[PDB]
Design a binder for this molecule. Structure first.
Ligand SMILES: [Mg+2]
Ligand SMILES: [Mg+2]
Ligand SMILES: [Mg+2]
Ligand SMILES: [Mg+2]
Ligand SMILES: [Mg+2]
Ligand SMILES: [Mg+2]
Ligand SMILES: [Mg+2]
Ligand SMILES: [Mg+2]
Ligand SMILES: [Mg+2]
Ligand SMILES: [Mg+2]
Ligand SMILES: [Mg+2]
Ligand SMILES: [Mg+2]
Ligand SMILES: [Mg+2]
Ligand SMILES: [Mg+2]
Ligand SMILES: [Mg+2]
Ligand SMILES: [Mg+2]
Ligand SMILES: [Mg+2]
Ligand SMILES: [Mg+2]
Ligand SMILES: [Mg+2]
Ligand SMILES: [Mg+2]
Ligand SMILES: [Mg+2]
Ligand SMILES: [Mg+2]
Ligand SMILES: [Mg+2]
Lengths: 144, 79, 65, 126, 132, 195, 251
RNA sequence: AACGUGUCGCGAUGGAUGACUUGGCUUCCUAUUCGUUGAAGAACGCAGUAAAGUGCGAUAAGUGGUAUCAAUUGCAGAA
RNA sequence: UAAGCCCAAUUAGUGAUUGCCCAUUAUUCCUUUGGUAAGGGCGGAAACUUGGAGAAAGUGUAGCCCUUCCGAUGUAGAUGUGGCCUGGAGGUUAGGACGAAGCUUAUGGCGUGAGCCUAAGAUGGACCGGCCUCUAGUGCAGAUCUUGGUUGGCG
RNA sequence: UGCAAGGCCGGAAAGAAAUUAGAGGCACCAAGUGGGCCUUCUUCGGUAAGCGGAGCAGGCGAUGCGGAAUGAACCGC
RNA sequence: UCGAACCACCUAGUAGCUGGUUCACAUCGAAGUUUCCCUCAGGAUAGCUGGUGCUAGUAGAAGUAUUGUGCGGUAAAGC
RNA sequence: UGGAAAUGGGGUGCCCCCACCCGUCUUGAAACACGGACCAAGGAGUCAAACAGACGCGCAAGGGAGGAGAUAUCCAGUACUUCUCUCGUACUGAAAGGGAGAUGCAAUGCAUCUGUGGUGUGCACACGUCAAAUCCGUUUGAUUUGCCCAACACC
RNA sequence: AAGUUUGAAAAGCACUUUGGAAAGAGAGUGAAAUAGAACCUGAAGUCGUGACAAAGACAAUGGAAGUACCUCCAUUUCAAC
């Protein structure tokens, strides 16, 4: 939409909102991010505090697949057991059998108290996670 | 599941009838009992009654001052 | 060209906002430790008391209702 | 067919023309506000021509009232007359200068038969 | 001015605009609806040409490699010499009756070929191969 | 007539910029009620409707449960269950397995929040259906729902100012943690400062 | 992409009593020393020469394309919304109209006309061919010479009987399988008196679902929840229970 | 008074505007890519009457083949 | 023997006030407009003649209707407008050889204005208006602007 | 033990610092501006200035109206 | 055309510099100062200002006085 | 007045008295500062991307695709789509890596819901208060929603 | 640069006579020649002559406020408010 613009709204204003003293120029405060340490240093040091440095060691060939560890908490396990799959979790005394990596979620983090007793099968599991489940009628199982 | 006060929020701005000609906001309504474009005078939306000699009906009887003229039209013009 | 003119009248347009009262940002922090390490432990007990005082309430308010 | 009563006094009659409008056969008799920094009109000297204020607004009770009472309403065909006939005291039709002659007679016939005043007519019959 | 904006990093400094001087280096997909129709028209027209053969060949299940995907199964190209030998078919003759052959896969786990060796003899069951 | 009273005018949001035809019905409902009644509720529930969409923060059923459990612990224990009104909309909470039979009145519900209520034993209402039950809003527990912790509100600030735990606008999360955000890069943004 | 820039001109310099713009170079020709490739000048480059990598096509969330088609059919069952928005349904026997699916059987159209009199929906069909006029204003020189109204569309379950109805002017032919907004609500106005062959309501419960079940085809799509069920917000502001707690007046 | 104004009617110049649009531009698509067997290019030519252009090459505004039917058209001429 | 200067005066030592003239100030009166400023109605009744305490549940208008308070200048700038306008699209309503666009104006009117509508053309000859959305190559007096044309100086 | 101290606390407490009480508090986004000048009061530098540099407030800029014949600034407003 | 020719192209070269930047009304409405900058014809940052607000707000109000209670070393004075 | 006046308009001229050429840079423009014969048509914040804020809408611990296919249809559109990806529900460390419920007994164990206090809508509570009558303005307890401040715990 | 885009049709002004012939005046064509090939519309600008307030210059213009006279412009009354 071009009618929904202010230099179309402010025809006849003679400056489209850029003033008479300081005339709208082309690039006049540097061009780009220029001057981050010279004349825009007060902007960078103050809205971008950590910019302009080096830190840590270099990981040359970084592959995000071997460094892939999605996480789910204990209070979010119910997100993987349908009410029908939990309808068998009511009868027969059969604990739910949750398998994380099929839904994503390599690692199992222990946050909150687990609402429903189940047995999760996760590649990775926290110490407090490994302990809340095994003391809530459940069991963590390590896979892969 | 759709009442008349919702059938008026949808049409308040546009219709076959709204006939905004200048700033007048008349209406070619069935219920021309006032010719306005208000939420109470248009029987196309509601179950309301228009004002002609048959007086077709679907209160709000501004038909009083709307049928007196309707008959006096033909009288004062039959020549 | 230093002027200071119009500045006192600029500071009084949107007003020279009064200071925040003491119950704002009264973080007794960075202050002298042996005080705040005691004004800490007494907060822990006074919270165990605040939690306990609500425990009888509800339980008194249940049976006595 | 007769109007309804009003108080039709008007604030200003001389139109607001732009400034230096006569000195140039190019400018228009159509108010554009002078954006000039030191124009005498914008900074409102004495013998300068005025600038449209909110202060010139007509009385709302008599705003849009044609000198014959009868606030105006454009009419294109005889069926739009019936849509006006209920306000034939408050509104008056105005045929639209593109309605040809064959249809303009079919209207001015119906108006008198409806007492719906038209701002247009008086061809050996008003 | 600037202020509390994300440092832009826009990467449009290499004459991509097809201006009056530069030929431009932009790829606009104004033809993808024509191409979707174009391919499905070849596809549906290649299918009645190859008929009664299936348009797509047979591809095996293979395990997507990394730890992110290792639990996801996928259709790889060709089977192996192994599944074909463990199902009878000569990989020279499998590659001519719709079965797709891959002389590079290594059958690292017997688990793997077992899903595919048996997957052949499903095809080799429901295939007529009427002679010429 | 010198005043000084030029900036004391507050922006109240007279109307709504919403175009939803089912909330302009609730607004005309709650101008009638908010105007021609002595109800403190109807006043308050009317400014919250004309309020914008970013300001009507959603309350999860968790928040609704817990605060309705903090009401229902001090009642006549047989008096009534007040109606949890939220002028935003209700979202399910997979961190609350068991939900009480509480009546709720929201402009909207998640498809998983409506079923979680109705499965629990409560009935989720509307506002054309609450104007029939306590239109004055007797026995109704009006609720906002947290709008802090919102990712917009925690960029608000500078992030390079001492005592500013705001998040810089940076797509690359591992871009700006260098000089200025390190104690060993000639200055570290002072994590605390009395204000 | 090189229009209006096709000359090889350079400003003469701020030393000659003319403007400072690139001026055509040469002689004999009338363009010699004329203004070159600016907004101002003839054969002069446009401002912001339009580009084909403009954003021509929009995404729309599926749930908004469905819940726009949903709320466009809801209006096709509200005869007040159809009388407004311009469809002549004064003596239509019912809205939403439904017709016994003996219509994929019409194979000539002299009878498919005699159908539209059986419903008096030939009124909305004659307002479409009476309103056939040359377009106004450079639509006519383009390929949009004529303009009609949108007429009552006949929604089919299949594509069988489109033969008797293809040539009638007006009377859109739609398919239940793919309800098409911009036809079910053209000009952005909900309305469009529709005809709904009998075999076309069969699927609407199936292809859209109910307020409590997902559809057969729009998968995971259930009808939304009405923000207020007693949509008659006025008939409760004049209710007995509200008047009891109103605030009394005094004058 | 004359001249100079100035408003109006009528004229002249001017060629805007509108209306039209066998052109442009843009987008997409279906197939096949010149030359030593002398190409592309340009040169000169050719019509009853032809300057340009289009077409053609001393078989020259076209010859042949098929396939169509009675014109071409400024006006000769011509089954 | 001031119409100068310095002091006073203000209807003349008779009895206690404003000698007198000028403003975009003040007071008061109308009218606009904003405040979302307060209210009251927010569908049918009577004061001698009509208007409204019967015009619709409403940001915004030709305001839903009244009436009440208060403010009202302004460059850069910001913002709003049921706000103005040009080209085109999707809708709707509608004109046109019984004369459309255009064009002319001592053609009025009406809007504060942008502008709109009308009439009348010894104009024009075939297209096009209103409204809701959409859209943009959308508003020009001024750039030693660009192009075309004319003109003065000037017979 | 109890004083005193901190974080608290309930029982209890009222005024026999004027005025306006023209509503407090934050928050977000974004311009424009970043050449000022004059002036009152005082005062640094200079022979001096319609000078340069300051402090204070007011102005002009950005603003007319009224009158000092005349004047960006003075006097009223 | 020469203290670096001419043509075409890169190229619409860059310009903190100069000129211009097209409707109305309404609602408000400033700044030439702070600090930093090879900075002083420009920026960035605060202040000024607008819009949108959120919020229980006669209060955490005040370019004001009073009352108490501190502070100071200029005028005058005194050598 | 009875069929041409009377008003309103607008055209012209005149009287009175008001009024300094516009745009522009600038603290300051009538300037002896700059640009300015006239008119016509052109003529200047635009598109793309990446962001953020606001606002509109959808769904919401999920949201959404894209590419592609699939197969019904004039249809470059509309309709459908598992699959995947994407953003995020979890943060942190330079890295190896690690990874947040609360309460009571304990210094891990067992029942396993705002975490604390404070400032704090609305409603229910009783509390009286000129109060037409008794519904509401006053208020005090209860829970306090959002928000904020303080300091717990935990990663 | 340049749409000759006259008109539906060239029906493209025969012919008379003024002119040395052009051109003009007449006719005539056609719905229009006030569509006559430098042709649809035909604007602004500037100019011409006719009229006028026939005014009246002592810069133009403009502002407010009147008045003079003149305006098929609107409205209203035209046995009445
Ligand atoms: Mg600047
Ligand atoms: Mg400057
Ligand atoms: Mg394994
Ligand atoms: Mg006027
Ligand atoms: Mg959070
Ligand atoms: Mg060009
Ligand atoms: Mg070029
Ligand atoms: Mg047009
Ligand atoms: Mg043209
Ligand atoms: Mg080749
Ligand atoms: Mg040869
Ligand atoms: Mg040739
Ligand atoms: Mg265009
Ligand atoms: Mg139309
Ligand atoms: Mg342009
Ligand atoms: Mg122009
Ligand atoms: Mg000029
Ligand atoms: Mg002054
Ligand atoms: Mg003097
Ligand atoms: Mg001394
Ligand atoms: Mg400058
Ligand atoms: Mg100067
Ligand atoms: Mg509390």
């Amino acid at each position: 939409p071009t009618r929904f613009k202010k230099c179309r709204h402010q025809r006849g204003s003679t400056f489209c909102g850029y003033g008479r003293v300081g005339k709208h120029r082309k690039h006049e405060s540097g061009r780009g991010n220029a001057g981050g340490m010279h004349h825009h240093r007060i902007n960078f040091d103050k809205y971008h505090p950590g910019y302009f440095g080096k830190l840590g060691m270099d990981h040359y060939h970084r592959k995000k697949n071997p460094m892939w560890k999605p996480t789910i908490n204990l209070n979010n396990l119910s997100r993987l057991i349908a009410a029908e799959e939990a309808a068998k979790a009511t009868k027969g005394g059969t604990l739910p059998v949750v398998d994380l990596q099929s839904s994503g979620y390599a690692k199992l983090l222990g946050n909150g108290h687990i609402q429903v007793p189940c047995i999760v099968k996760a590649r990775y599991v926290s110490k407090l996670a490994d302990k809340k489940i095994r003391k809530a009628g459940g069991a963590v199982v390590l896979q892969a | 599941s759709h009442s008349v006060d919702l059938q008026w929020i949808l049409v308040r701005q546009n219709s076959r009838f709204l006939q905004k000609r200048g700033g007048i906001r008349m209406s070619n309504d069935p219920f021309n009992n006032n010719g306005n474009w208000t939420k109470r005078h248009c029987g196309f939306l509601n179950e309301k009654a228009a004002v002609v000699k048959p007086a077709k009906g679907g209160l709000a009887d501004v038909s009083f001052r709307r049928a007196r003229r309707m008959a006096c039209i033909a009288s004062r013009t039959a020549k | 060209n230093h002027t200071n003119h119009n500045q006192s009248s600029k500071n009084h347009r949107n007003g020279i906002k009064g200071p925040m009262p003491l119950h704002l940002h009264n973080s007794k922090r960075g202050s002298w430790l042996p005080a705040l390490v005691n004004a800490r432990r007494v907060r822990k007990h006074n919270q165990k008391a605040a939690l306990k005082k609500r425990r009888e309430r509800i339980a008194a308010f249940a049976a006595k209702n | 067919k007769p109007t309804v009563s009003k108080a039709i006094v008007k604030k200003r009659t001389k139109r607001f023309t732009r400034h230096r409008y006569e000195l140039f056969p190019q400018l228009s008799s159509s108010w554009r506000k002078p954006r000039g920094e030191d124009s005498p009109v914008r900074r409102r000297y004495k013998g300068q021509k005025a600038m449209p204020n909110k202060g010139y607004g007509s009385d709302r009770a008599t705003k849009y009232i044609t000198p014959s009472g009868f606030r105006s309403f454009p009419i294109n065909n005889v069926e739009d007359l019936y849509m006006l006939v209920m306000q034939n005291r408050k509104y008056a039709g105005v045929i639209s200068h593109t309605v040809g002659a064959r249809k303009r007679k079919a209207i001015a016939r119906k108006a008198m038969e409806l007492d719906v005043r038209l701002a247009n007519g008086n061809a050996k019959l008003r | 001015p600037k202020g509390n904006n994300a440092i832009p990093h826009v990467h449009q400094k290499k004459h991509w605009n097809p201006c009056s001087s530069q030929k431009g280096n932009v790829k606009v997909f104004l033809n993808q609806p024509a191409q979707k129709h174009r391919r499905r028209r070849l596809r549906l027209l290649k299918a009645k040409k190859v008929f009664p053969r299936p348009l797509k060949a047979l591809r095996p299940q293979v395990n997507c490699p990394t730890v992110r995907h290792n639990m996801k199964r996928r259709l790889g190209r060709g089977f192996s010499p192994a599944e074909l030998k463990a199902a009878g078919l000569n990989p020279q003759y499998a590659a001519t009756i719709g079965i797709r052959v891959d002389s590079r896969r290594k059958n690292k786990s017997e688990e793997g070929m077992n899903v595919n060796v048996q997957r052949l003899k499903t095809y080799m069951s429901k295939l007529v191969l009427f002679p010429m | 007539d010198l005043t000084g009273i030029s900036k004391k005018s507050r922006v109240i949001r007279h109307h709504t910029y919403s175009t939803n035809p089912y909330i302009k019905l609730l607004i005309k409902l709650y101008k009638f009620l908010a105007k021609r009644t002595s109800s403190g509720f109807n006043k308050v529930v009317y400014q919250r409707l004309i309020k914008s969409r970013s300001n009507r923060a959603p309350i999860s059923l968790s928040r609704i449960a817990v605060v309705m459990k903090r009401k229902a612990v001090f009642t006549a224990k047989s008096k009534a269950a007040p109606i949890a009104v939220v002028v935003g909309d209700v979202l399910d909470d997979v961190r609350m397995a068991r939900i009480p039979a509480m009546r709720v009145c929201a402009l909207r519900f998640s498809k998983s929040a409506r079923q979680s209520i109705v499965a629990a034993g409560g009935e989720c209402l509307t506002f054309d259906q609450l104007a029939m039950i306590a239109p004055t809003g007797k026995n109704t527990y009006l609720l906002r729902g947290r709008k802090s912790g919102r990712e917009s509100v925690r960029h608000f600030g500078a992030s390079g100012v001492p005592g500013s735990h705001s998040k810089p606008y940076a797509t690359n999360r591992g871009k700006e943690t260098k000089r200025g955000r390190r104690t060993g890069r000639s200055y570290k943004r002072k994590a605390f400062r009395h204000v | 992409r090189l229009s209006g820039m096709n000359h090889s001109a350079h400003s003469w310099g701020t030393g000659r009593a003319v403007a400072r713009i690139p001026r055509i170079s040469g002689g004999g020709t009338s363009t010699s020393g004329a203004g070159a490739f600016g907004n101002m000048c003839r054969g002069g480059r446009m401002f912001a020469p339009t580009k084909i990598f403009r954003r021509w096509h929009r995404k729309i969330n599926l749930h908004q394309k469905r819940f726009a088609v949903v709320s466009a059919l809801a209006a096709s069952s509200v005869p007040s919304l159809v009388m407004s928005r311009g469809h002549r349904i004064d003596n239509v026997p019912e809205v939403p109209l439904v017709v016994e699916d003996s219509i994929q059987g019409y194979e000539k159209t002299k009878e498919a006309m005699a159908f539209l009199k059986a419903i008096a929906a030939i009124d909305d069909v004659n307002r479409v061919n009476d309103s056939r006029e040359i377009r106004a204003g450079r639509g006519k020189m383009r390929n949009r010479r004529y303009v009609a109204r949108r007429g009552p569309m006949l929604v089919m379950p299949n594509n069988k009987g489109t033969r008797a109805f293809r040539n009638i002017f007006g009377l859109d032919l739609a398919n239940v399988s793919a309800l098409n907004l911009l036809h079910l609500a053209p000009g952005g106005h909900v309305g469009r008196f529709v005809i709904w062959t009998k075999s076309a309501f069969e699927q609407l419960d199936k292809i859209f679902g109910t307020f409590t079940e997902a559809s057969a085809v729009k998968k995971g799509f259930t009808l939304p929840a009405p923000m207020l069920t007693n949509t008659d917000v006025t008939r409760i502001m004049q209710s007995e229970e509200v008047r009891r707690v109103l605030k009394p007046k005094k004058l």
